[PDB]
Symmetry: D2
Subunit: 468 residues, 4 copies
């Protein structure tokens, strides 16, 4: 028995708010979950096409994973990273030998507890390996929230600052942490189109975004730039780059003697219909960061995978870094089971298939809806650009530079979400003009149809314009 | 089943060698130490060796290893969840905050609201962000030898040289590599350790007003940089990794000084929290209340990853007025929250804080006797299940390792008294030692038995005999 | 009956032994002694005369050793002496009155001046005031900007070869930036105005007509938050960085900063005081900044002086507070006497109009040279400040690939502008550039036509040699 | 003939204020100067026992210096540092061979225009030579105002920020430049004593301030620390260290492999009754910075002098640093003449002997004035600790951590100055409770008598309470 009224009371009173003021806050109790559904205390079932934070890849409450965690609990317990366990050794083995067995770059893994911790770790390693301070990120990148990971996060609305309630006159950024000179922000891969939608390139055929990034590094001195960090599809920032961007980044970094870190926290583990996002582009990074789909959120886990050469350098020294819960044996038991089910049940192929299906459904919805400017993606990770049906331009001018000071009733993705909710579906986005769609890798055709139907409905209401 | 070997530990050790990044050891020197299972205060190796753990891992398995009520409660949560992020409400998350504020701290007026995260470093990151936003000021004051975590923001307030995630050599003190760029934009002042400013006797020095000199110098730094730009002073009441106990007056004088200067006080309870010192929280020994505390470790007794920040009513009311653009995927994870609830309920139900207090008294008497028989014991101090023992050369009464708490792990461990002690004690099946070269850091579960305390103190006696025999040099 | 006896060989020996080197290693260094100067000429101790078409550092605007300025300095020395900024003198108040009332009397923005000793000091001052006025930390500069060498001014300098680091001798292997230089720097590097051009030379614009350089600048400010950006700092023509912007860039920057609520600092240390054929470089663009910085032509290097001029609204804000800033030599009365005399001579003899007229002359001279020499890819400028783009005559592309991102680790014998300089020297003319593919030409504002002909002649000769390829 | 009423109008209207609001500002015109006097337009003569900013060492408007400047002006003109001149070369030879000919450490000079520029240069050189980022300064040190020099200035009231008019309700530090992570502030040399005023030494005899400084360097890693920067007597900060502090800093820096930069901008060129302040302590630095007394403020000049080994390192590279007016030949002529007159007329011994006279005058004043807690100094650089006689403690509690937001009618050194001005004497200090006394090195005994007489008068008034 649960007194859910008392839960709501304690939630309001004793928990710090995020994204909502206390004044506007309404708690949203979830009593249990299963597959692609959340279940409220009263039995209301919600089809979650956010997959929480694109991070419950295997599906909610997988029985094999939960069984594996219970088995681990018969033995552990807790030991820290200095001690060896079967679960932690095996989890690293599955990643390097089984998932990445066909690639030569993978060297060694360090496990930590969250994606931000994985990014912090990758930044530290890249800087130690190169003995260089600067890291290049991109406009709209999101790489986590802790002090080091936030420095390479250039998504204005997600930098742990304060904004007002339906007022944009109240921006407060964290003092002493609102900019960092050890990071250079390169432009979005998406910023160099001409008025016809064609890509701008230099005389050598290099995308202008890449060429600009190259010039920034030359100007600061390649001898002081450790790495470029990317997302192959910007997650929170909600954008897909030109196909040639990632290959050209790989090339450019090799030529300049600079490491490439690809952040796979969100794109990893089948999200994009391949094992990793980078594998769509025929190149291999120096370092990747992992979270989310690593355990499909069953328990907190993050990881960094470094190349053979980076691993060999680190092996030669005593590294003075300790994180209490890094390698936690029960979280590692969850990771092993998560990955074993993903492999065994061919979840990556499932995602590719469901993605091809989703593309079809979006082709149909676009023909039917003028507020869809474009859509793109793969697997269970899609963007849909929303535009004013009349003007063919976005409703919110600041777009990906907006802040949460805005009134949600003026935000197209907030409007869409609220309408789709009437149909028992959670679907929308985090950017004002852009849908961010994702479900479990094994989402059913039936649930995809249900989601797309609710979206059809929300888009009718949006294009009616009676919300304005 | 006909299966008689679930795990191939030989295979595990090869994977561990090959595929896992090393910490504190080079690959060349590394020797894996596999642990197949744990229970109470014991670690069990796959060959059956049982080790009595008087490190309690990292002073963090407060309830004891593999508590059956906690593990049962985790299994029950797995019937319902699943995963939801912080935007959604659950019974476990809400109850965990309620237990902390209403139940454990029900006799105190300052507590306002909790944010749950996944680790102690994430809790410190959160506390720094909130202190800076609340005051609208950039600077944070820390102390020499403080350890507050390893992530970029938490590391800025960590001033323990050997724990800042840099690289050192294999038995060579001449190859330090710090992380390039790690202080680009750090807004932190290092104030002195409470413990510096000592007599020849050992008195901690005060001015004419009776203000400790460590506190007076901290006041002067904040004045100099301008109190209007200092968001907070962050402390540990007993430095954990740094291995130090302050003079009794230090923490009360810090509270008074911060109030007078209009500066926040963050006390980091990640290690001292949840009965570790024989009160619920370390700050409670000192008759003062902080503005913010950070938590981890004993918050869940490491059963699953959890960290938390608790801010005052004042601070919570301020944050409540704004939309806070901060998201952490696993913050408030419902299964981790289930573990925190059960951990705290057991801790309350069974009076673990009183158990720790009593065992600490019993440890004090054991340590008094060891001191009477070993001149290598300079002094000792502590409470509950958290103890320091200063080790000295019995002949000179000066520490063996001159750099002391400013050492690095580039040193050869065969020269480090706490490594010597530890290696010897292991012959008795006991893990006991410390992280600083001249200072033991001793801790066990809050419910450790008298028999295990005796066993660990016996092992220590034996190790000290060996250290004092000088044969190791 | 008294000789000013100087042992010049001893001078050279002391110079080698006792003075720190810049730009040259000790081993490759050869001292070049200058005994006196006059107009546009440097005189060596043996009497050799060198026509200086660098005007040293584009900074001796009035001409070398102007008799009127030097007499006015001698006159001030009858009274001073030294007093610091807390005390008032005629020379210091008059210098400020001349700038505000007599030179910029046709504009309404000017409020108050603070005098300092150098252009880097003036830039340090401008950064401090902009940040204090807006109560905001970030300043936006551009790729290849040069704003000075001191700690604050260097943060907004993004010219790689001029950031007081170390490079090797004819090796790009060993090189060192100053450790710890960026700990705390609150600076964003925006694109240079020239960054987005097509193969015809047209600078690219978005739909409504905004230059892409400006558009990305605005996007960076939006992303970091306009509420924390104090200012954008510019040069209207990049000095050391050797570049001219498209006409619309500066008006667009003025427009964008007004729209975003951000200050515009224009750095006039090099382009100021007649250098571009108008009193100040920004005056070619029909806009007015919030703050400018001054040096060089401010005193025509007669004595060290720099200055910052701030708008009326900024001045009114500063006036309401006690500002805790002291510089020992700020306002030095004898330096202020030099500034007053330099500016009075400049106004009374119409040096600005002379500069405009001579620029039109130089323009005509460079057209002829470009017709005769294919290694001239393009040229641009005004008054006595010219860039000439030097290219391979056959490809019409630059020889040195790193271009404005080069370092002084390069061998000078591979640098086109070094080659041109070396050749022109045979003719007793100093002319060339600081960037590898780009001439940077300047003389005194009152330079004579005959001297212009003589410099252009030397360049004719140099370019012949460049275009034979023998080097 | 000058219209001083109009000068005063232009000064009010067109010049930026420092230390005063426009509201409270009263211009103080000075028409000419000579020796130790400033002469107002109406002929009023003021005896200047601040020597402006402790910087007109030779005396005001020395005729031999002024004649040398006029001669230079018959030749120059301007040439930058790439060209050699007799004045610039000779200035360098005068410093290294003539003034410092008895010492082995001096290598090479770089001339710049100001003391802050000199400090900026030294910071850059120390960091380049060691290839390390951190520089240790001390609480209350003043090393200049420009961006790099300000990072090592830890004198609160002199960091170019804003304060209010007789109030605390406004106050603003320069955003983005109010603290720096590349500097560590070590304690002031008089850190703590015991109640009796005994110095605290450890078992190795090391003063607590030095031992603490040592621990900071160990903590941050000696391999990361380029230099310790000092003033042998804090100039603006107004303090004299224990005799043994400086020797022990020299020893500690040598042991740790760290450079020692001593800032001689104020203590340099006879100010302390020796050629340089450091020379009272029997040790030699690695780098010194110079200004003020370098030209006795006749024209703007500063300089850095680096050791032979630092000079040999720098000589091996191409240094990409330019400062337009560095080495200005007319400023260099002034420097030459200044140093020649000092040498030829034994200004250093004049300073030493006058300091001994000042000492006996202050001794007599202290017998008669219980508001004098203590005094110390040498040459023409003195501090006097002012206290409330009836409490034996300073009147202004924040002391050297005060700000200029305070009312000057509550500041003892302001009271003293205002009163002393009735006798045509300028004397006082810049810290609230501490006089800072200096005149030209060739100041006459008659002028010392006249200044000390006016101080005696000022202290009668202070002690009377009538100001309160
Ligand atoms: C590419 C990437 N890297 C690192 C992290 C940081 O991982 P964490 O949270 O510390 O475990 C994240 C998390 N993003 C958040 C939760 C998100 C995702 C989508 C929309 C809005 C927000 C990420 O996407
Ligand atoms: C006061 C304090 N705060 C924060 C953290 C950071 O917590 P985390 O690891 O991110 O969950 C810790 C952890 N310390 C480490 C693991 C330690 C303890 C003793 C000896 C050596 C190392 C801590 O002691
Ligand atoms: C736009 C600008 N701002 C500030 C300063 C800094 O003034 P300063 O030197 O401190 O008096 C300068 C100086 N430039 C140097 C001397 C230069 C010029 C041309 C080529 C190479 C270098 C400048 O051009
Ligand atoms: C030790 C020292 N170093 C560097 C400088 C910086 O020299 P500058 O001004 O850039 O030529 C100074 C200047 N001090 C100021 C002007 C002062 C002195 C006494 C009281 C109050 C203020 C200094 O004392």
């Amino acid at each position: 028995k649960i007194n859910w009224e008392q839960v709501k009371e304690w939630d309001r009173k004793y928990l710090m708010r995020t994204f909502s003021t206390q004044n506007e806050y309404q708690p949203v109790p979830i009593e249990s979950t299963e597959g692609d559904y959340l279940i409220m205390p009263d039995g209301t079932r919600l089809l979650d096409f956010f997959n929480q934070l694109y991070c419950v890849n295997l599906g909610q409450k997988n029985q094999k994973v939960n069984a594996a965690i219970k088995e681990a609990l018969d033995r552990y317990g807790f030991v820290w990273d200095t001690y060896a366990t079967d679960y932690k050794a095996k989890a690293a083995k599955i990643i390097i030998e089984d998932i990445l067995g066909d690639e030569d770059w993978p060297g060694k893994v360090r496990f930590v507890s969250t994606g931000s911790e994985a990014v912090e770790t990758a930044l530290n390693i890249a800087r130690l390996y190169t003995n260089r301070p600067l890291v290049v990120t991109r406009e709209h990148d999101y790489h986590g929230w802790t002090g080091g990971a936030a420095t390479v996060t250039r998504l204005r609305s997600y930098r742990s600052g304060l904004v007002g309630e339906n007022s944009e006159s109240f921006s407060a950024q964290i003092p002493g942490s609102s900019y960092n000179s050890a990071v250079l922000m390169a432009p979005s891969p998406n910023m160099f189109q001409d008025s016809d939608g064609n890509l701008l390139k230099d005389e050598n055929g290099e995308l202008l975004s890449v060429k600009y990034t190259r010039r920034m590094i030359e100007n600061y001195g390649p001898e002081q730039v450790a790495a470029v960090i990317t997302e192959v599809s910007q997650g929170a920032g909600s954008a897909m780059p030109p196909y040639e961007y990632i290959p050209q980044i790989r090339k450019m970094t090799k030529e300049l003697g600079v490491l490439w870190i690809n952040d796979e926290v969100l794109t990893g583990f089948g999200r994009t219909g391949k094992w990793f996002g980078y594998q769509h582009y025929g190149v291999q990074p120096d370092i990747i960061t992992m979270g989310k789909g690593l355990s499909s959120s069953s328990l907190p886990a993050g990881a960094v995978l470094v190349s053979k050469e980076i691993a060999a350098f680190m092996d030669k020294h005593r590294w003075e870094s300790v994180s209490t819960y890094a390698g936690h044996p029960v979280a590692m038991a969850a990771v092993c089971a998560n990955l074993e089910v993903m492999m065994e049940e061919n979840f990556v192929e499932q995602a590719k298939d469901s993605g091809e299906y989703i593309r079809s459904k979006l082709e149909l919805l676009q023909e039917k809806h003028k507020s869809i400017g474009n859509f793109d993606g793969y697997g269970l990770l899609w963007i849909v650009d929303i535009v004013n049906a009349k003007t063919k331009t976005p409703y919110v001018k600041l777009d990906r530079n907006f802040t949460h000071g805005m009134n949600p009733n003026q935000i197209p993705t907030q409007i869409i979400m609220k309408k789709a909710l009437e149909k028992g579906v959670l679907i929308g986005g985090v950017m004002p003009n852009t849908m961010r769609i994702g479900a479990s890798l094994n989402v059913s055709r039936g649930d995809i149809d249900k989601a797309m139907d609710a979206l059809d409905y929300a888009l009718d209401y949006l294009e009616s314009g009676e919300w304005q």
